[PDB]
Design a protein around this motif. Structure first.
Motif, PDB file in Angstrom:
ATOM      1  N   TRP B 255      48.306  30.861  34.705  1.00 29.24           N
ATOM      2  CA  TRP B 255      47.940  32.296  34.562  1.00 29.24           C
ATOM      3  C   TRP B 255      46.766  32.426  33.604  1.00 29.24           C
ATOM      4  CZ3 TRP B 255      48.972  36.208  37.634  1.00 29.24           C
ATOM      5  CH2 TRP B 255      48.703  37.506  37.210  1.00 29.24           C
ATOM      6  N   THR B 256      45.682  33.075  34.050  1.00 29.90           N
ATOM      7  CA  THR B 256      44.381  33.173  33.329  1.00 29.90           C
ATOM      8  C   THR B 256      44.084  34.616  32.912  1.00 29.90           C
ATOM      9  OG1 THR B 256      43.043  33.437  35.335  1.00 29.90           O
ATOM     10  CG2 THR B 256      43.410  31.188  34.573  1.00 29.90           C
ATOM     11  N   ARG B 257      44.804  35.605  33.432  1.00 28.15           N
ATOM     12  CA  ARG B 257      44.559  37.043  33.130  1.00 28.15           C
ATOM     13  C   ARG B 257      45.393  37.462  31.907  1.00 28.15           C
ATOM     14  NH1 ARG B 257      45.303  39.688  39.110  1.00 28.15           N
ATOM     15  NH2 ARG B 257      45.986  37.733  40.081  1.00 28.15           N
ATOM     16  N   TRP B 262      50.211  40.762  34.764  1.00 31.14           N
ATOM     17  CA  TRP B 262      51.210  39.942  35.488  1.00 31.14           C
ATOM     18  C   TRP B 262      52.268  40.841  36.129  1.00 31.14           C
ATOM     19  CZ3 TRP B 262      56.484  38.847  35.052  1.00 31.14           C
ATOM     20  CH2 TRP B 262      56.919  37.727  35.773  1.00 31.14           C
ATOM     21  N   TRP B 263      52.608  41.966  35.488  1.00 32.76           N
ATOM     22  CA  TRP B 263      53.694  42.886  35.935  1.00 32.76           C
ATOM     23  C   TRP B 263      53.230  43.733  37.131  1.00 32.76           C
ATOM     24  CZ3 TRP B 263      58.591  42.288  34.083  1.00 32.76           C
ATOM     25  CH2 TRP B 263      58.728  41.504  32.938  1.00 32.76           C
ATOM     26  N   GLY B 264      51.961  43.602  37.543  1.00 28.97           N
ATOM     27  CA  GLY B 264      51.440  44.020  38.863  1.00 28.97           C
ATOM     28  C   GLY B 264      52.361  43.643  40.024  1.00 28.97           C
TER      29      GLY B 264
ATOM     30  N   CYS D   1      53.683  35.068  41.808  1.00 30.75           N
ATOM     31  CA  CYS D   1      53.214  35.867  40.665  1.00 30.75           C
ATOM     32  C   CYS D   1      52.206  35.068  39.804  1.00 30.75           C
ATOM     33  CB  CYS D   1      54.425  36.305  39.846  1.00 30.75           C
ATOM     34  SG  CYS D   1      55.993  36.383  40.767  1.00 30.75           S
ATOM     35  N   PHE D   2      51.666  33.937  40.289  1.00 28.13           N
ATOM     36  CA  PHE D   2      51.027  32.848  39.491  1.00 28.13           C
ATOM     37  C   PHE D   2      49.634  32.476  40.046  1.00 28.13           C
ATOM     38  CE2 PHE D   2      51.562  28.248  41.164  1.00 28.13           C
ATOM     39  CZ  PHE D   2      51.389  28.608  42.485  1.00 28.13           C
ATOM     40  N   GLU D   3      48.828  31.763  39.251  1.00 30.58           N
ATOM     41  CA  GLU D   3      47.482  31.229  39.619  1.00 30.58           C
ATOM     42  C   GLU D   3      47.462  29.717  39.410  1.00 30.58           C
ATOM     43  OE1 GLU D   3      45.078  33.388  36.726  1.00 30.58           O
ATOM     44  OE2 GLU D   3      44.335  34.659  38.350  1.00 30.58           O
ATOM     45  N   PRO D   4      47.232  28.901  40.467  1.00 37.93           N
ATOM     46  CA  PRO D   4      47.284  27.445  40.325  1.00 37.93           C
ATOM     47  C   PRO D   4      46.136  26.815  39.541  1.00 37.93           C
ATOM     48  CG  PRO D   4      46.505  28.040  42.515  1.00 37.93           C
ATOM     49  CD  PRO D   4      46.955  29.326  41.849  1.00 37.93           C
TER      50      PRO D   4
END
Ligand code: BCB
Ligand code: BCB
Ligand code: BCB
Ligand code: BPB
Ligand code: BPB
Ligand code: HEC
Ligand code: HEC
Ligand code: HEC
Ligand code: HEC
Ligand code: NS5
Ligand code: OLC
Ligand code: UQ1
Ligand code: UQ1
Ligand code: LDA
Ligand code: LDA
Ligand code: FE2
Lengths: 247, 273, 323, 332
Positions: B255-257, B262-264, D1-4
């Motif tokens: 996760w980069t944001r 994330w709760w989107g 819900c994630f980014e690899p």
């Protein structure tokens, strides 16, 4: 500049910083560390000034104890100084399982039966506590064999001892195969399967010398210690190579 | 130099390595093989901190900071002064911690007690590895690790949180914080309960297990029990870091944001958008 | 392995015990029921529960606070029930946004907040009487109540005492999931970084300390369950091998040890000191310290670091710079 | 819900401060592709002939330019702002000096504004500068604009849901949230900080102890100021697709020197530039625009950081046309 000047204008927060540290080192060193020394002090061979006055407890069923207890330690001839260096381990003089030293050591607990709030014996077999049952869904272990460390069946489960204060089983009673005697085992040493009880702590023949109760339907605090300690002894002493490394 | 009840317990045995070569005490301290290796790794580590400190501006141990390397060094080795010290010290730190854990096993075995304490102690060692080893591997540089200074390490936690805009919305963090709070409360209630029974005051009589259960049944309608509160306490404390670890690992590699965004997944479901 | 430290292999059932207290025996309510699955990891018995007046007073006052919060939250989504369920975490009841000082705010800008706060306070005070009085009824010390009192004092500090000392209701904690979290960052920012408040440090030392102590203590007692170590009362009045082994484990590891009694004092003190240290930090914040970072700088306590990208002058300070 | 993984990371502070950017490559790739659509500069032309100030009849801005140059400006302006509708977006065919269409008079003001950016705000735009394209991206309505109340979607080319529409009162908290990077902060930082120069972004005292006469009762700023500043910073962060550590060492948000990066000073100039644009060029256009272009308070669409940046630290990754179109400025 000035000899003895510091670069500090005093403010309230700085003052409260020093006071907080003072309160912390006071509570720890002069109260908590004093309370820590109520058992086992004064220290022995082969401290004084920072010990508190002994504490007195009013027990629930009459009497008083003062701590530390003055009862002496009894398994002192049962160990010997191999070496002149105080750090050196001590060596047993006999069979340490039977002599009750190292991890087979019991404490000099009182020869009284632990009681419920209302004065009954706390830890009793289900033949006595007939108003207590095993919960629907669990193994009733009465009738089942007890398999020791060596794979040999050592006896048969005759009863469970329940804690009447806490509603919790604490011991199994088994008849020992080849004797006219009963032995208690703490449930903590018991793997309860559907068809058997597995005991890895001692061998089959070693159930012969489990400490014996003075009485059949009740146990004393010192007896609970004696029984529990025996099996813990097994962890280090049931075979010669259990007290050796895994080098 | 012995507790009044201690002598009967001071027997040979329970070591994992070395037989009885290291099977002895110095004052109150048991040694063992892992006692020797602990002292090795501690002595190396403290030496390196001293060597590093002497090459730096100040001797004030609150301003001392041995920092990891720049990101450009990746997973490679760095010059001593530019994060090499940091790398050496991390190895000694792990050495000392793992030694300490295995020493507690030898002590447990000698006393014929469960291994529960050294097992519990693996939890903080794991979390240290997540921060200093696993998360940096996944991002490709040692430079992502936290620095060894008493105050400097707080500035790293601070900036790390704000790299994700608001760290408070991190779901692993919410779990971690919940366990830290309920644990501190539970320890107060447990400590307070035991003292309340043994010390009713005014030369009144010590109370019972029955009084413990009655107290909490009255106040909240349930009492978990004497053995169970100890198992629960190990559970609540351990879960501070076991849940925390997923929140830390996820931040960067998964996760980069910002964490609020994330709760989107919940907010932006089409049927109520 | 001691499987008993993991779960109860064989559960006991027996008659429900009742310990009589000086008063209130008649305000106990409900039939106890047993739960097989709870019984694996704890005591199977749920109920009964004591009510009394402090109990009912607390539920009345608490419910009032929750209804005031829920109604203002429902208003923030214009009473659309689907949007209410969606946005719930984002919804809050806020203290005044404008500066009325200690002025009672209007209902639309902080008045409901102050109502909800008052009822929550009366709820906590009622619960404190329940926790204290139940201890006295059963002939127990009041150690729990004094721990609880420190926690309540801390909620009072962030809720009304700090706002009063600096003279603005605007500084209070909003009611809501995310809104109460947002306050932590607003407050830290306003007061120059809570990492540089020494009482934040103390509080965290003790909180981390509570984790270390309950892991250690929970594990120590499971490690000596075989010897009845869980029976901590009678191990206090009559030292068994359980707490001898426990003491020596710690003496041989770290070189000193507590008693089975004194470790509970360590636990209780560490827990209390989380709340006491936090409260002292809040009392000093805004009253006697405006910026915690600059306060550390003033006392030589703040670290500095080399440039990495060029040092950047404040543009506001340059000659010919706009407002 | 994630980014690899992998993730791309940079360093903006001393080693061991955990300062720097954190970027998902797919997301960088998608923005780079969007922004690569920037039309190329048209072929240069030699300045043959007289200045259009004495050829054409109604040139008030580009009068010093030459007929070939001026027509080149007009072809650029057209592909940048109204490629679909062509020259007739702003022009009557029967008279190219006629101001009869609303877009003509706005366009003149837009030339003045673009030249003022590239001339008076070099402290923000440096030698990269802006064209019409920077904001407009090939449509008369720029895709990222602000009204005096929060609107969704952020991109006006996407269609609103019933709940996103400004009239649905139940979607307000979500309109506010998606402008503040999904925070619950209860403040509109555009109207508070970017529409005008009434409010100060700085809230943190510059003294260790509270100053007497600013620190009790009605003399102290409410805590709501701290919250509002935080909401601007969440908005500014998401508008550039970056985080707090791009500009600050979180050790002391309030400190410059080593505690801020050069990007923070550039951002400070950006706040001043946006206020100038809004107060003096964009707000006053409400008198020149049709009602279909105005918000519910009769306001003209205005600019925030995203209007130019659209989720990148440098708009269009630093693509420049400054040397290709000197008539857009800077002007000596
Ligand atoms: C601005 C920044 C934020 C932030 C950033 C943050 C980050 C980046 C991370 C956390 C994490 C955590 N945060 Mg947190 N945070 C927390 C609470 C917590 C912790 C529960 C949790 C885990 C801590 C940890 O990893 O210890 C680690 C402790 C270790 C490793 C100790 C190891 C000990 C070692 C084995 C032994 C050492 C021996 C000694 C050297 C011996 C010497 C002593 C003597 C004998 C000589 C609270 C309660 C709050 C509040 C009230 O707001 C908060 C706010 C914030 N956090 C801010 C919003 N937080 C961590 C987490 O889990 O996140 C999900 C984490 O990674
Ligand atoms: C994910 C976030 C983390 C974090 C966030 C954090 C915050 C927010 C705060 C602290 C604070 C502290 N941290 Mg830290 N931290 C620390 C140690 C410390 C202490 C200096 C202090 C109090 C901790 C305490 O009482 O715990 C409980 C343990 C107790 C009570 C037992 C006693 C431990 C003893 C006091 C520790 C002393 C350690 C030595 C100074 C270091 C070793 C020196 C060597 C050479 C012998 C260590 C040793 C580690 C390791 C090895 O991982 C660590 C990891 C982390 N901390 C993570 C990076 N920490 C507090 C502080 O005041 O710092 C200025 C504080 O506010
Ligand atoms: C950017 C934001 C920061 C921040 C802002 C912050 C603030 C503003 C405050 C703290 C505080 C504290 N911070 Mg901290 N923080 C902390 C940890 C902590 C806590 C130990 C400490 C005390 C709070 C507490 O126990 O509340 C948990 C316990 C509570 C709230 C007591 C509640 C008891 C009550 C009786 C419960 C009753 C509930 C009812 C039943 C419910 C009914 C409700 C209905 C009716 C509505 C860590 C471990 C970290 C890390 C790892 O980074 C961190 C970083 C940060 N904090 C950042 C720097 N922090 C506090 C402090 O110590 O200040 C000096 C504090 O005031
Ligand atoms: C370090 C010290 C720690 C500490 C210490 C201690 N903490 C204690 C004690 C000590 C010593 C107690 O003696 C007391 C207790 O008893 O223990 C069982 C207690 C407590 N700590 C609680 C919560 C807590 N502690 C927190 C923190 C720390 N604690 C810190 C960490 C946190 C955090 C971290 O946020 C939380 C959330 C509660 C469980 C309890 C108070 C209940 C109350 O005061 O009641 C308020 C009473 C009510 C009845 C209101 C709520 C119920 C409503 C009505 C439910 C129904 C709603 C319905 C009507 C709406 C429907 C409407 C419509 C649809 C029809
Ligand atoms: C969730 C589970 C919790 C938990 C659990 C348990 N915790 C345990 C046990 C359990 C079960 C033990 O049995 C063991 C112990 O014996 O208890 C007395 C222990 C211990 N927990 C300590 C510290 C501690 N626990 C923390 C956290 C939790 N504990 C969490 C909360 C925290 C923080 C920060 O929170 C701290 C600081 C030591 C006191 C002790 C290890 C001593 C050691 O390993 O000696 C060996 C090592 C040394 C004596 C020094 C090594 C010097 C190195 C080489 C050089 C320096 C390294 C460098 C990293 C320094 C930079 C510092 C910088 C950041 C400023
Ligand atoms: C709005 C975005 C415009 C589009 C599209 C086109 N033009 Fe334009 N034009 C515009 C303005 C505001 C002005 C006045 C500029 C000034 O400095 O004040 C102009 C001017 C002209 C002229 C000069 C006409 C005269 O005054 O006599 C010509 C010849 C002209 N424009 C031509 C032209 C062509 C061919 C276009 C499509 C390629 C075109 N314009 C587009 C605004 C806008
Ligand atoms: C961002 C800083 C901008 C730059 C650079 C340019 N424009 Fe613009 N423009 C901007 C806004 C916020 C608005 C208002 C919204 C709207 O669509 O009206 C505008 C408006 C126009 C218009 C009117 C379009 C219409 O409503 O139909 C025109 C014709 C226009 N802008 C042209 C234009 C030109 C030619 C530019 C380069 C010289 C230019 N704009 C720059 C924002 C920004
Ligand atoms: C650059 C692109 C920035 C990013 C990203 C963030 N901030 Fe910022 N911040 C920036 C500037 C130029 C300013 C000063 C504005 C002015 O007009 O003076 C600020 C200000 C703050 C402040 C207030 C500081 C004070 O003196 O009172 C705070 C508290 C702050 N910024 C915090 C902050 C956070 C938490 C961010 C990530 C969410 C963040 N900022 C991003 C520039 C930039
Ligand atoms: C169009 C008129 C713009 C608006 C509105 C804002 N910015 Fe900007 N910004 C713009 C350009 C053309 C450039 C490039 C200059 C260059 O260095 O190439 C920038 C640059 C920045 C930067 C620096 C990025 C870096 O150095 O890597 C920052 C930090 C920045 N801009 C921030 C910023 C903020 C916070 C704004 C809203 C207040 C804002 N910009 C508006 C063009 C435009
Ligand atoms: C002068 C006059 C008239 C009065 C004086 C007023 C006075 C003394 C006011 C005091 C106000 C105080 C102390 C305010 C404190 C506010 C604080 C600390 C708020 C903190 C947290 C709020 C939260 C988490 C709110 C959540 C809200 C909800 C979840 C909606 C309702 C549902 C619940 C509460 C159930 C959630 C379950 C959870 C409690 C575990
Ligand atoms: C920036 C300011 C914040 C600073 C950080 C706060 C640190 C945590 C606070 C208290 C821990 C108290 C520790 C208690 C440890 C016990 C030490 C001890 O008992 O001493 C042994 C001796 O042998 C006995 O005779
Ligand atoms: C002996 O210790 C304790 C109990 O056993 C009687 C409890 O039931 C409880 C209560 C547990 C719950 C979940 C109410 C606590 C806190 C405790 O410390
Ligand atoms: C995991 O995310 C969830 C929410 O928001 C993020 C909710 O609002 C809610 C709704 C909560 C209430 C009290 C209505 C639930 C159940 C939930 O699971
Ligand atoms: C929140 C639910 C309550 C369950 C707590 C007890 C779980 C025990 C089972 C797994 C952990 C066993 N343990 C602590 C010995 O490792
Ligand atoms: C802090 C204010 C407390 C609120 C007062 C209302 C609570 C009522 C308590 C009733 C007293 C209970 N009893 C019978 C033990 O005295
Ligand atoms: Fe305990």
């Amino acid at each position: 500049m000035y000899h003895g000047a510091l670069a500090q204008h005093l403010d309230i927060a700085q003052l409260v910083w020093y006071a907080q540290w003072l309160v912390i080192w006071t509570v720890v060193l002069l109260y908590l560390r004093r309370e820590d020394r109520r058992e086992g002090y004064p220290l022995v061979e082969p401290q004084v000034y920072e010990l508190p006055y002994p504490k007195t407890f009013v027990l629930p069923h009459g009497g008083t104890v003062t701590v530390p207890r003055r009862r002496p330690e009894t398994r002192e001839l049962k160990l010997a100084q191999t070496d002149g260096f105080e750090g050196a381990p001590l060596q047993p003089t006999g069979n340490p399982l039977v002599d009750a030293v190292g991890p087979a050591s019991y404490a000099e607990r009182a020869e009284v039966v632990d009681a419920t709030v209302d004065g009954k014996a706390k830890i009793v077999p289900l033949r006595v506590a007939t108003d207590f049952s095993i919960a629907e869904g669990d193994v009733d272990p009465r009738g089942l064999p007890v398999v020791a460390a060596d794979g040999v069946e050592a006896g048969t489960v005759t009863d469970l001892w329940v804690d009447r204060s806490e509603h919790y089983f604490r011991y199994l009673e088994l008849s020992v195969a080849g004797s006219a005697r009963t032995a208690l085992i703490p449930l903590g040493f018991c793997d309860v399967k559907k068809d058997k009880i597995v005991v890895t702590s001692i061998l089959s023949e070693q159930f012969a010398n489990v400490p014996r109760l003075q009485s059949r339907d009740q146990i004393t605090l010192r007896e609970e210690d004696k029984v529990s300690a025996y099996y813990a002894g097994g962890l280090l002493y049931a075979t010669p190579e259990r007290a050796e490394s895994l080098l | 130099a012995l507790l009044s009840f201690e002598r009967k317990y001071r027997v040979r045995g329970g070591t994992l390595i070395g037989g009885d070569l290291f099977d002895f005490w110095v004052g109150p301290y048991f040694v063992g093989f892992f006692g020797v290796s602990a002292i090795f790794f501690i002595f190396l580590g403290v030496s390196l901190i001293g060597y590093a400190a002497s090459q730096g501006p100040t001797w004030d141990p609150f301003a001392i900071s041995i920092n990891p390397p720049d990101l450009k060094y990746g997973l490679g080795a760095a010059p001593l002064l530019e994060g090499g010290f940091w790398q050496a010290i991390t190895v000694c730190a792990l050495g000392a911690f793992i030694s300490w854990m295995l020493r507690e096993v030898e002590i447990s075995r000698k006393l014929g007690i469960g291994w529960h304490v050294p097992l519990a102690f693996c939890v903080p060692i794991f979390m240290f590895c997540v921060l200093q080893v696993f998360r940096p591997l996944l991002l490709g540089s040692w430079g992502h690790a936290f620095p060894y200074g008493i105050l400097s390490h707080l500035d790293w936690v601070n900036n790390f949180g704000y790299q994700y805009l608001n760290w408070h919305y991190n779901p692993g963090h919410m779990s971690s914080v919940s366990f830290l709070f309920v644990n501190a409360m539970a320890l107060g209630l447990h400590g307070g309960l035991i003292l309340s029974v043994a010390n009713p005051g005014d030369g009144d009589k010590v109370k019972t297990a029955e009084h413990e259960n009655q107290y909490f049944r009255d106040v909240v309608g349930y009492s978990i029990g004497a053995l169970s509160i100890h198992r629960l306490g190990l559970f609540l404390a351990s879960n501070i870091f076991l849940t925390g670890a997923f929140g830390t690992i996820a931040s960067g590699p998964f996760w980069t944001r910002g964490w609020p965004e994330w709760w989107g997944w919940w907010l932006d479901i089409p049927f109520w958008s | 392995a001691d499987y008993q430290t993991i779960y109860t292999q064989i559960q006991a059932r027996g008659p429900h015990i009742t310990v009589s207290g000086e008063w209130g025996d008649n305000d106990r309510v409900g039939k106890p029921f047993y739960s097989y699955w709870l019984g694996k990891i704890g005591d199977a018995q749920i109920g009964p529960i004591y009510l009394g007046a402090s109990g009912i007073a607390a539920f009345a006052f608490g419910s009032t606070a929750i209804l005031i919060i829920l109604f203002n939250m429902a208003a923030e989504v214009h009473f659309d029930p689907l949007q209410f369920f969606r946005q719930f975490f984002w919804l809050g009841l806020y203290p005044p946004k404008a500066q009325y000082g200690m002025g009672i705010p209007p209902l639309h800008d902080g008045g409901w907040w102050l109502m909800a706060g008052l009822f929550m306070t009366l709820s906590l005070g009622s619960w404190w009487i329940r926790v204290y009085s139940r201890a006295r009824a059963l002939g127990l010390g009041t150690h729990i109540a004094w721990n609880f009192a420190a926690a309540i004092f801390f909620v009072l500090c962030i809720g009304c005492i700090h706002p009063t000392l600096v003279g603005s209701w605007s500084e209070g904690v909003p009611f809501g999931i995310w809104p109460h979290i947002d306050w932590l960052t607003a407050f830290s920012i306003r007061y120059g970084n809570f990492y540089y408040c020494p009482w934040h440090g103390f509080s965290i030392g003790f909180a981390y300390g509570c984790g270390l102590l309950f892991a250690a203590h929970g594990a120590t007692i499971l490690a000596v369950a075989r010897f009845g170590g869980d029976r901590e009362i009678e191990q206090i009045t009559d030292r068994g091998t359980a707490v001898e082994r426990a003491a020596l484990f710690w003496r041989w590891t770290i070189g000193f040890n507590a008693t089975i009694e004194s470790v509970h004092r360590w636990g209780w003190f560490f827990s209390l000191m989380v709340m006491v240290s936090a409260s002292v930090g809040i009392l000093l914040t805004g009253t006697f310290v405006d910026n915690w970072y600059l306060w550390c700088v003033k006392h030589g306590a703040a670290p500095d670091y080399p440039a990495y990208l060029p040092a950047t002058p404040d543009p506001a300070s340059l000659p010919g710079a706009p407002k | 819900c994630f980014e690899p993984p992998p993730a791309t990371t940079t360093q903006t502070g001393f080693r061991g401060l955990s300062m720097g950017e954190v970027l998902h490559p797919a997301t960088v790739k998608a923005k780079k592709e969007r922004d690569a659509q920037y039309p190329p500069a048209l072929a240069a032309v030699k300045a043959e002939g007289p200045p259009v100030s004495q050829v054409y009849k109604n040139v008030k801005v580009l009068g010093n330019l030459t007929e070939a140059e001026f027509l080149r400006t007009m072809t650029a302006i057209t592909e940048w702002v109204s490629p679909q509708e062509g020259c007739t977006y702003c022009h009557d065919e029967n008279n190219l000096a006629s101001e009869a269409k609303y877009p003509y008079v706005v366009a003149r003001r837009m030339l003045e504004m673009t030249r003022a950016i590239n001339t008076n705000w070099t402290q923000h735009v440096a030698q990269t500068g802006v064209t019409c394209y920077t904001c407009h991206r090939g449509t008369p309505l720029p895709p990222y604009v602000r009204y005096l109340e929060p609107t969704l979607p952020l991109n006006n080319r996407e269609t609103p849901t019933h709940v996103e529409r400004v009239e649905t009162r139940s979607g307000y908290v979500v309109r506010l949230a998606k402008y503040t990077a999904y925070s619950a902060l209860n403040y509109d930082p555009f109207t508070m900080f970017l529409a005008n120069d009434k409010r100060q972004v700085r809230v943190v005292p510059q003294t260790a102890l509270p100053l007497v006469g600013v620190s009790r009762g009605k003399e102290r700023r409410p805590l709501s100021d701290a919250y509002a500043t935080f909401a601007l910073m969440m908005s500014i962060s998401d508008s550039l697709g970056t985080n707090c550590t791009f500009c600050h060492n979180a050790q002391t948000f309030e400190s410059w020197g080593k505690k801020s990066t050069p990007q923070r000073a550039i951002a400070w100039w950006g706040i001043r530039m946006v206020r100038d644009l809004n107060m003096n060029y964009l707000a006053p256009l409400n008198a020149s625009l049709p009602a279909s272009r105005l918000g519910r308070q009769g306001e003209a669409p205005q600019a925030d950081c995203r209007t130019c940046h659209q989720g990148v630290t440098k708009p269009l990754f630093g693509a420049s046309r400054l040397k290709d179109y000197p008539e857009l400025g800077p002007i000596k």
